[PDB]
Amino acid sequence: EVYSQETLAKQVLQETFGYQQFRPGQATIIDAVLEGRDCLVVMPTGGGKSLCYQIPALVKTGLTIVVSPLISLMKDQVDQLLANGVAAACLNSTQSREEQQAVLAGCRTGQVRLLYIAPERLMMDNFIDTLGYWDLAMVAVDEAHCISQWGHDFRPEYAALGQLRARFPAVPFMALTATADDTTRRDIVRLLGLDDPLIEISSFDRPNIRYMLMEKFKPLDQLMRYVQEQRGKSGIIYCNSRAKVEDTAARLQSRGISAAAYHAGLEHEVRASVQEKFQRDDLQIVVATVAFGMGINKPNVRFVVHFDIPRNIESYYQETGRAGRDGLPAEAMLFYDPADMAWLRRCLEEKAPGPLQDIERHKLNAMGAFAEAQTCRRLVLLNYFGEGRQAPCGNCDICLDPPRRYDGLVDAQKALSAIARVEQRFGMGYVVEVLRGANNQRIRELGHDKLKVYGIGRDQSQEHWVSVIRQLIHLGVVTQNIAQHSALQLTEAARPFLRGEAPLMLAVPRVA
DNA sequence: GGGTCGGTGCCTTA
Ligand SMILES: [Zn+2]
Known part of the structure; x- marks a missing residue:
């Protein structure tokens, strides 16, 4: 039957939106949802994200609810649809009660074909009860990555949309997003209750x-x-x-x-x-x-x-x-x-x-x-x-x-030497002053001139050396213990690098 | 030389 539904969809694509043909993968997504299957759409490239649910919404007889994370998004999307002659509406707190009553009346009547709504409004127990007395054709969750990105802490009603999916098992659900790795994809399926969804991923x-x-x-x-x-x-x-x-x-x-x-x-x-x-x-x-x-x-x-x-x-x-x-x-x-x-x-x-x-x-x-x-x-x-x-x-x-890499054993020995010179007590801002033997008070008030580490590495600029210490922290040779004032302590890997036994290669830093 | 570094949004009708 599949050819019949796509022709109806093709006609909507041309008549209400003015576009000529489906782009690759658009037809397969719209076909799937038009025959009742759930869908997860990950479309980081393609620009045809919104058409993927709006076209089946206009082909199906009944109401489509579009779950939206932001009031401004609801309004922009409703505006574009009304500019195309589509009976779209939304619900949000910025409306008056009389305005909301008119939207809901149009939903019960079927004048409204697409309703944009936030999860906090839609998941209210009494609101879900009035949903049953409408003709619900489809639910589409836009920016579905919010289900996983926000449903666990910031906005818990995003994790409750599954309760809606369980309440209307015969209405197809779509999740659509632009960015989602594997963990987020499975979480969307899990938290939304999609039943063996078609998963379509375009290129990143x-x-x-x-x-x-x-x-x-x-x-x-x-x-x-x-x-x-x-x-x-x-x-x-x-x-x-x-x-x-x-x-x-x-x-x-x-x-x-x-x-x-x-x-x-x-x-x-x-x-x-x-x-x-x-x-x-x-x-x-x-x-x-x-x-x-x-x-x-x-x-x-x-x-x-x-x-x-x-x-x-x-x-x-x-x-x-x-x-x-x-x-x-x-x-x-x-x-x-x-x-x-x-x-x-x-x-x-x-x-x-x-x-x-x-x-x-x-x-x-x-x-x-x-x-x-x-x-x-x-x-x-x-x-x-x-x-x-x-x-x-x-x-x-x-x-x-x-x-580009260079032999760091020389520079790393000079650095690893000077950090033990303090007995694990100075932070990076302190330790890099002695490696370039600049004149200041605590290098004498504590007496840190009478070490040969003072004034040993003025040879090279300041960016070069703090880069070295960062590279040694990344390799596990130095720690930054922030439990004692960000002081650089020495680990157990440090040993063969002061002895010159282990070879060492360091990258030069990223600079314009 | 300076983050002393969190930050995202719906919804209120006892
Ligand atoms: Zn590249």
């Missing part, structure tokens, strides 16, 4: 995006230099904390660079104005927390900067994926400091042990492995998402500037 390759990493040495200065080299094209700078995004914004506005902070601490209409100025290109740069995310419709973001490393590869992929949507060259730049990773691990140890923390820890660890990789950045991303590839890309920082 964005050839026009250039993945770049720079080691954080003087962060603000490097961030200043990178932006001033962008010569006024649009971009986003992500940081962790609201305080940081507010500070950095003011520093760039101190130069005359068009830049504005964005975070959830700002009143909402401020958020709408910054998002709108940015999108109409009257604002060059947005400094932002993760709050600046879903629903940003801007085709010409030319750079996305991560001033702080994200928590997992999915977040990094989704965030860098906002760049170069027009297909023209764009750049992703990550300012990496291993200290930011250890800060992220603390935040994780701060939470309850168990399987959820085990996964968050592995996701974090994989992100740190992406940052530390001495191989094509694109090969790490693609394979992490299960898309097998071995050919390096030629458009990452590893491919364009291959790593």
Whole structure:
């Protein structure tokens, strides 16, 4: 029968949307849902995510409920559908009671064909009761990765949508998202109760995006230099904390660079104005927390900067994926400091042990492995998402500037010697002063001139040496014990490196 | 030389 349903779908594709043909995989997804099967759609490339549920919604007789994470997303999606003559509506707190009653009346009557709604509203026990007295044709959960990303802590009603799926077993369910690795895919199936879903995964390759990493040495200065080299094209700078995004914004506005902070601490209409100025290109740069995310419709973001490393590869992929949507060259730049990773691990140890923390820890660890990789950045991303590839890309920082290594036994002995010289007590900021024998008070107030480690490594610049110590921490030769003021202690692997018995190769740092 | 670093959003009708 399959041919009959697709022709009805093809007609909707042409009549209400004006498009000519289905693109590869669109037909197979729409076919599946039109014959009653559940579906999980992971579409990082393709741009036809919304059509995958909106077209079967218009072919099926009955109501389609679209679960949506953001009020602004609901409104934008409803607006586009009404512009196409489709009877779409949404429900949210910003409406009046009279407005909501009219939406619900249209739902009972069937005037409304697609209803956009947040999980917190839909999962109310009495609301689900009134659903039974409608003609429900399909449920589609947009940005379904929220089920897993938020359903366990931030917004628990995202994990309750399975209760809805169990209440209406004969109504097909769709989960659709742009970013999801294997763990997230199975979690969506599990928490949503999809019954043997068709799983369709498109490619994660964005050839026009250039993945770049720079080691954080003087962060603000490097961030200043990178932006001033962008010569006024649009971009986003992500940081962790609201305080940081507010500070950095003011520093760039101190130069005359068009830049504005964005975070959830700002009143909402401020958020709408910054998002709108940015999108109409009257604002060059947005400094932002993760709050600046879903629903940003801007085709010409030319750079996305991560001033702080994200928590997992999915977040990094989704965030860098906002760049170069027009297909023209764009750049992703990550300012990496291993200290930011250890800060992220603390935040994780701060939470309850168990399987959820085990996964968050592995996701974090994989992100740190992406940052530390001495191989094509694109090969790490693609394979992490299960898309097998071995050919390096030629458009990452590893491919364009291959790593170069030098014998570090000399420099690492000079460093490993000077860190034992303090008896495990100084931090990295202290220890690197003695290796370049700069003149200051505690190198005499404690008496740290009468060591031959003082003034031994002025030969090379400051970035070179703290890079060495970071490399030794990564190899397990030095620890950073933050339980005693970030002092560098020495481990048991340190021994053969001071003796010169073990060979050692170190990479030069990432610098522009 | 400076994060002393968390951060994401629905929904309120006793
Ligand atoms: Zn590459």
